[PDB]
């Protein structure tokens, strides 16, 4: 065929060529040695990879049987826990330890703030995310509902001064709250000067300095009329841009044009659940963008490029620089899937996670070298890889061994390849300390991946009985315990000042007032970072890190244990007679709509993340984990007789045209209705639900990938 032979491997040519021509030059890695390394690591680690996947299946079969064999109404927690221990699911917790991970950048070890996640196959989005380190607070306030569109203050086609004024006043208050003046308010400022290394703020009847002069980090322009003033609070920078010759500056009492906030200080470039990549061509598109980001030369159509560092004058008068870019992680795929980018002599596809480590690892070397500017990414010499969907410490150890072996192939120092552990599978949750210990010399974060975690929750106890509704899951005892337990594990392992303790995505992209009002819970909970779906939401979530002293919050949580194993293990079973018929129908429609809405963009257009209108037309930006949840929940309800297979069909058929109409503003869209059996997307949605109970841990990829490939093939013939 078209493939390249390397040992027992047959490498898709598009991949072979990309690596030889694009990825390898400049890494000083001998191309032949590299490919021999690929062959050898794949040969050596494939059996253990398959062994771990089989173990998941066996543990799940035993749990299914445990539930099927009993008919008591309340779960005997003591017996359940004993059983889980006996089968090797719940492992002993190791003695206290402190992570030793080193060579990590300050953005990760020290700085608390928002973290962006973006699909790596979308070059423009990736570039926007990387540039989102600094963002306009005025743009974020004016452009969203954080400033209400009440009478007189609504967005028009052109600039509304009443709205602009609300924006200005909101930000003045932020300034008062974050970097307080000794006396008076920023709301009454008339100017800013730097005198003998001190920030002086002019008021009407007097002048004043900062309550804490140390929050003054610098400025631009002349000290006697700066163009901007740089502040710092809780390690995050705040920049006041001064220019009366600007749209809003002319209206402003101190000539202030904008307030820029340091926002997304880290960004995860995603190869997993926000992208649709099912063959060699898709992986190469992803790898090519990852390469462009690391070499610093990625450029997208509508011409977008990466930002340079930002130049400042220190308070004393000396010069310095700050990073202009969000520090990048890459999220590899997990241990499950294979991909035909490489097959063996049998035609057997190679594990995609192994490939990701080799290739995203190889590619990240460019981020440690000069960009033809200074190097793009890690100044401390680390490569940062988020690893999703791991179950238990053995799976964590395997990943670490994979990274070690890749480090050899790449001629990299051991432990160069750091690991962001997603805690989004129940067997990881209940063995979290052990998972951290397995990666104690590589771990740079843990994060509560809650949509996925809920999917795993449902699949794991699928045989136990009907689960509560999807909307109910977010407030269930198990998940609230999971959230605290994650923080507790991290802090006890010494994450404070060493590694990120992260929480999940705000998915409601247009509900920013709600985000600002409520997402503050996450840093109040001791999280040094949390996920936001866009640069705009990053700028807004930043506010939370100014109001909350995360470092202090973490210090106060030290040595506390706020969740028991019993709480973690509390299965979200719905109570008897929980739902009226109408509520059941709502929930079915809800879930069928969320499956159809997402699947149709995935299968038809290879889009894995977008603003998808939900059943109530609320814009949600969710990755593939939303599919895992909805399909598992419906499968759970079908399994326990809450709904019939005709209910599912009727809902699918009822919701399909609604999704069709929701996609009206898209020229590439093909209506699913009314020829359902001719729509691969519709059939994919159906299959995910009807085959849901039989998918390993409820994973949707084997079905989704097959259907997407099916669509790709039909579109060519
Ligand atoms: O990882 C999980 O389990 C859920 C993460 S939610 C998410 C939404 C959107 C994008 Cl672009 C990325 C992630
Ligand atoms: Mg996930």
UniProtKB/Swiss-Prot annotation:
The cofactor binding remark recorded in the entry reads: Mg(2+). Mn(2+) is able to replace Mg(2+).
Q: What is the activity regulation entry? A: By bromopyruvate, oxalate, and phosphoenolpyruvate. Malate inhibits the activity to 50% at 1 mM concentration. Glycolate inhibits only at fairly high concentrations.
Q: Which organism is the protein's source?
A: Mycobacterium tuberculosis (strain ATCC 25618 / H37Rv)
- Identification of the protein by name: Malate synthase G
Could you say which residues bind acetyl-CoA here? 117, 124-128, 274, 304, 533, 608-611, 623
Catalytic function, reaction form: glyoxylate + acetyl-CoA + H2O = (S)-malate + CoA + H(+)
Identify one Pfam family in the record. Answer: MSG_insertion
Q: Which GO terms describe its biological process?
A: adhesion of symbiont to host; coenzyme A metabolic process; glyoxylate catabolic process; glyoxylate cycle; tricarboxylic acid cycle
* Residues annotated as transmembrane: none
Which molecular function terms from Gene Ontology are attached? coenzyme A binding; fibronectin binding; host cell extracellular matrix binding; laminin binding; magnesium ion binding; malate synthase activity; protein homodimerization activity
> Could you name the Gene Ontology cellular component terms for this entry?
capsule; cell surface; cytoplasm; cytosol; extracellular region; peptidoglycan-based cell wall; plasma membrane
Pathway recorded for this protein? Carbohydrate metabolism; glyoxylate cycle; (S)-malate from isocitrate: step 2/2
EC number(s) on file: 2.3.3.9
Q: Does the keyword Signal apply?
A: no
Q: Which UniProt keywords apply?
A: Cytoplasm, Glyoxylate bypass, Magnesium, Metal-binding, Oxidation, Transferase, Tricarboxylic acid cycle
Describe, as the record does, how this protein assembles with itself and its partners.
Homodimer.
Where are the Cysteine sulfenic acid (-SOH) modifications?
609
Q: What role is this protein assigned?
A: Involved in the glycolate utilization. Catalyzes the condensation and subsequent hydrolysis of acetyl-coenzyme A (acetyl-CoA) and glyoxylate to form malate and CoA.
| CDD domains assigned to the protein according to its UniProt record, in alphabetical order | malate_synt_G (cd00728)
Active-site residues from the entry? 331, 623
Family from the record: Belongs to the malate synthase family. GlcB subfamily.
Residues that bind glyoxylate, according to the entry? 331, 424, 449-452
* Record flagged with keyword Transferase: yes
């Amino acid at each position: 065929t078209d493939r390249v032979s390397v040992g027992n491997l047959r490498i898709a040519r598009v991949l072979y060529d990309f690596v030889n021509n694009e990825a390898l030059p400049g890494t000083d890695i001998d191309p032949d040695s590299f490919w021999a390394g690929v062959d050898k690591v794949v040969a050596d680690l494939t059996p253990q990879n398959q062994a771990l996947l089989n173990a998941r299946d066996e543990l799940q079969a035993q749990i299914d049987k445990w539930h099927r064999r009993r008919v008591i109404e309340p779960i005997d927690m003591d017996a359940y826990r004993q059983f889980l221990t006996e089968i090797g699911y719940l492992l002993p917790e190791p003695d206290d330890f402190t992570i030793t991970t080193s060579g990590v950048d300050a953005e990760i070890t020290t700085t608390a703030g928002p973290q962006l996640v973006v699909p790596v196959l979308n070059a423009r989005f990736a570039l926007n995310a990387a540039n989102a380190r600094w963002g306009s607070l005025y743009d974020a306030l004016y452009g969203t509902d954080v400033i209400p569109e009440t009478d007189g203050a609504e967005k028009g086609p052109t600039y509304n001064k009443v709205r602009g004024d609300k924006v200005i006043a909101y930000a003045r208050k932020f300034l008062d709250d974050s970097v307080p003046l000794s006396s008076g308010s920023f709301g009454d400022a008339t100017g800013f000067t730097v005198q003998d290394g001190q920030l002086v703020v002019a008021l009407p009847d007097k002048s004043t300095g900062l309550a804490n002069p140390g929050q003054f980090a610098g400025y631009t322009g002349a000290a006697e009329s700066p163009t901007s003033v740089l502040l710092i609070n809780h390690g995050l920078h705040i920049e006041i841009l001064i220019d009366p010759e600007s749209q809003v500056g002319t209206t402003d009492r101190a000539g202030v044009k904008d307030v820029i906030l340091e926002s997304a200080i880290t960004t995860i470039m995603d190869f997993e659940d926000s992208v649709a990549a099912v063959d060699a061509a898709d992986k190469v598109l992803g790898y090519r963008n990852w390469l462009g980001l690391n070499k610093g030369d990625l450029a997208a159509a509508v011409l977008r490029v990466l930002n340079r560092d930002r130049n400042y004058t220190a308070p004393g008068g000396g010069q310095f620089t700050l990073p202009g870019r969000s520090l990048m992680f890459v999220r590899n795929v997990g241990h499950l899937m294979t991909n035909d980018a490489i097959v063996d002599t049998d035609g057997s596809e190679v594990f995609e996670g192994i490939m990701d480590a080799l290739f995203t690892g190889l590619i990240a070397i460019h981020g440690l070298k000069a960009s033809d500017g200074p190097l793009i990414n890690s100044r401390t010499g680390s490569i940062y890889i988020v690893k999703p969907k791991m179950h238990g410490p053995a799976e964590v150890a395997f990943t670490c061994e994979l990274f070690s072996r890749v480090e050899d192939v790449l001629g990299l120092p051991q432990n160069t390849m750091k690991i962001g552990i997603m805690d989004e599978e129940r067997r990881t949750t209940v063995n979290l300390k052990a998972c951290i210990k397995a990666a104690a010399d590589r771990v740079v974060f843990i994060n509560t991946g809650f949509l996925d975690r809920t999917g795993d929750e449902i699949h794991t106890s699928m045989e136990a009985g009907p689960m509560v509704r999807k909307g109910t899951m977010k407030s269930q005892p198990w998940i609230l315990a999971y959230e605290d337990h994650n923080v507790d594990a991290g802090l006890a392992a010494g994450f404070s000042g060493r590694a990120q303790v992260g929480k999940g995505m705000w998915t409601m992209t247009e509900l920013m007032a709600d985000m600002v009002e409520t997402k503050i819970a996450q840093p109040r909970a001791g999280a040094s970072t949390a996920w936001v779906p866009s640069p705009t939401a990053a700028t807004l979530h930043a506010l939370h890190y100014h109001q909350v002293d995360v470092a202090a919050v973490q210090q106060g949580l030290a040595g506390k244990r706020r969740a028991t194993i019993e709480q973690l293990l509390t299965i979200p079973l719905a109570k008897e007679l929980a739902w009226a018929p109408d509520e059941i129908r709502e929930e079915v429609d809800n879930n069928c709509q969320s499956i159809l809405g997402y699947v149709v963009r995935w299968v038809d257009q290879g889009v894995g993340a977008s603003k998808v209108p939900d059943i109530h037309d609320v814009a949600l930006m969710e990755d593939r984990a939303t599919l895992r949840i909805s399909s598992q929940l419906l499968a759970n309800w079908l399994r326990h007789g809450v709904i019939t297979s005709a209910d599912v069909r009727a809902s699918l058929e009822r919701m399909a045209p609604l999704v069709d109409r929701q996609n009206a503003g898209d020229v590439a869209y093909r209506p699913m209705a009314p020829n359902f059996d001719d729509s691969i997307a519709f059939l994919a949605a159906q299959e995910l639900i009807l085959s849901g109970a039989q998918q390993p841990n409820g994973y949707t990829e084997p079905i989704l990938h097959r259907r997407r490939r099916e669509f790709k093939a039909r579109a060519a013939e």
